[PDB]
Chain A
Amino acid sequence: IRAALQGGPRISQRLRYDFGPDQRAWLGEVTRRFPILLENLMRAVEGTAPDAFFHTAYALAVLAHLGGRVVPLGDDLPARFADSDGHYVFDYYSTSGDTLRLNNRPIAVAMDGDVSKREQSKCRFMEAVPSTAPRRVCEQYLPGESYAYLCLGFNRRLCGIVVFPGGFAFTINIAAYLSLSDPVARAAVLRFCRKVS
């Protein structure tokens, strides 16, 4: 996060939305409120239990990436498409008050038109095959639709995009900063994964 936000960057939007003239005073609040959210992301992800942390979608991007470093996941969560680009797994954190995760099934969203040019990209949900008994409120919304949800998520080759209210986002390369060694990583995969038959 320090490498992406070093100095003074212009957080340009990478997504496609439509604005009203009254909506700028909502977006004007996004400016003044902004940096405290970047603490609260690093606070709330720290504050979870390590048993609960391996049920985060942030850990699912790590465990899928270390499989390439045919390895499925033990929890059967992410999309069937493990293609190295164009597929993202999202967690939502609230912009308001107590910043807590408002998901327990991660959200698989595909986009078209990422890093290769700084362009807009439309969003789309993945599938609707699992409907296990509780459905959440937050799964109905695409990222960047809402006033309420900061959005966070990662690629199969583990590149990070952080979607804000208003479609604003920026890229993050976590993979240049993982200091996990190969005997540590192979031990972490086999305790959390399965094998495709």
Chain B
Amino acid sequence: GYRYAAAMVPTGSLLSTIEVASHRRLFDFFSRVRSDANSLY
């Protein structure tokens, strides 16, 4: 699980938005979160 406080202050943002769940198979830690789950805190 990646640190949620780390992504609070990002270095640089992405530009082109795609369905990221198109390919989970090329990633390491991936979690789809409907609007606001409990475990973010």
A–B contact at 8 Å CB threshold (below): no
Seen from chain B, the residues whose Cβ lies within 8 Å of a Cβ on chain A are none
